[PDB]
């Protein structure tokens, strides 16, 4: 067969996505995602590439992910897929890039620095 490929990176969580045509069926490191990510029932938004690009679908899923917790790990899914569909064919950049899906929003946790204590807040002041 022929597995298209996209590779996503958010929040230490790399998404080596082995997309391939077929049915559409999830294996987060040889394991379905549904039980896996706490809790979680937000997987509608993860097949967004199917929601809006070559809609409905589907193409079959293998994926090799690691790093971080579920969220940014559940966000490299998108860039993995969409980058894999632009790899499939950039025909639908005009419905992908209208939803972005290639902007790996590089925001992260900034360094720690003076004043920052158990939660990030500027100090309290002296008074009277």
């Amino acid at each position: 067969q022929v597995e298209y490929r996209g590779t996503g990176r958010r929040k230490n969580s790399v998404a080596r996505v082995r997309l391939v045509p077929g049915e559409g069926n999830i294996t987060v490191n040889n394991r379905d995602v549904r039980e896996y990510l706490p809790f979680e029932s937000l997987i509608l938004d993860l097949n967004q590439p199917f929601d809006v690009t070559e809609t409905k679908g589907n193409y079959d899923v293998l994926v090799n992910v690691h790093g971080g917790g579920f969220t940014g790990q559940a966000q490299a899914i998108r860039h993995g897929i969409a980058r894999a569909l632009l790899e499939a064919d950039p025909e639908y950049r005009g419905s992908l890039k209208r939803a972005g899906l290639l902007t790996r929003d590089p925001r992260m946790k900034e360094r720690k620095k003076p004043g920052l204590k158990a939660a990030r807040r500027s100090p309290q002041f002296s008074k009277r």
């Binding site: 706490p38 809790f39 979680e40 029932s41 937000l42 938004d45």
Partner: protein
Amino acid sequence: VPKRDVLPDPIHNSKLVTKLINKIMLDGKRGTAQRILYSAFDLVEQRSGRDALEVFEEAINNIMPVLEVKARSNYQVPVEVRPERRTTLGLRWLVNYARLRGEKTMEDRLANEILDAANNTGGAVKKREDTHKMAEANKAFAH
């Protein structure tokens, strides 16, 4: 300065419910906030067998004022309030008037409240009124 879109809610394919979760999503713990909310769905969708969107759009439109005011010494002015701040207004008076019910469970007070204003009752319809009482009492000295 723009305002932090929610894509949809992947429950109901809605939007408003997420806008509300983020006010309930204490500690960022959406798991427990969407927990207590889904509980809210089955419970209220049991009592008076209906949908959320019916009691939701109903009761969210029953407390939602169309006016409120502001100061500027401080002179308090009447203004047609803008809509998204009016949305988060209904959301906020809703939930903040909710928890003070003196009731134990996560959800019963909530459904009690939306069901309250669903029949044009409840203190959030009341504050809607007093807003609409000060307003048009606030026309003289400020308009």
